[PDB]
Design a protein around this ligand. Structure first.
Ligand SMILES: Nc1ncnc2c1ncn2[C@@H]1O[C@H](COP(=O)(O)OP(=O)(O)O)[C@@H](O)[C@H]1O
Ligand SMILES: [Ca+2]
Lengths: 77, 207
């Protein structure tokens, strides 16, 4: 029954490789951005708070759609 | 012929078996991801929201939170490099190292001219070559009692080829079926010339 075993291992692997590329791209980028922007936002707490809040709503969105995306890369639908 | 209709009913079922195994893996991985990354992303959204809440109320607590968010983004970045590397599986350059060890320590002289290292080899194909290679050298150390073993890794035009030759005693007639199968699966081939020691020619399309 190996015959099926080892071939199916090959397909998992491939599947694994695919997800891996997708993730790598989108996510590296999005996490760096979130770091950056959360830092600008900190820079404004005092000097311009309304701005800092908008920036934070932004960071919130990029984290949300980041989840979505991961979810999508691994979507079975 | 009808050789066609048949090869294609075969293709159809292979494909279906295919999407089941595929999907099973994707789900398993989806759980892993929820569990790590999904949680970190969610957390970042949470803290950034909290911070926003504290802008006027407690500016210091908000700054503290944003520092927290920055850290969890950093560490998540890490999680990701690691994950993806790990999911990429074992890499051919690395398998080369592995077998240098194995040979040297089973006391066999290892021969390797470094060359035009191929350029557009899918990660999957890289993995099959690494596998076929580990096994071929295993068989060297187990069956040949050769004194020397040379591996060549060359770009030929359709395909990458890796040969492994040993000046030892071809016995037998599991590993070899395994190699022919993986290789076969990627639209490549195994060849076995015993004309003077065990010589193995593992060719696979680049893709
Ligand atoms: N480098 C080698 N030198 C001598 N014999 C070999 C070599 N490689 C393979 N063989 C022979 O081919 C047979 C089949 O090998 P394989 O398919 O790897 O199964 P196993 O290693 O379990 O025998 C081996 O039993 C071995 O005797
Ligand atoms: Ca073997």
């Amino acid at each position: 029954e190996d015959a099926n075993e080892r071939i199916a291992e090959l397909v998992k692997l491939e599947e694994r490789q695919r997800i891996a590329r997708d993730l790598e791209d989108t996510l590296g980028q999005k996490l760096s951005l979130i770091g950056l922007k959360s830092d600008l936002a900190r820079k404004l707490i005092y000097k311009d708070p309304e701005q800092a809040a908008r920036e934070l709503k932004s960071v919130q969105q990029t984290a949300r759609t980041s989840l979505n995306e991961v979810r999508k890369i691994v979507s079975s639908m």
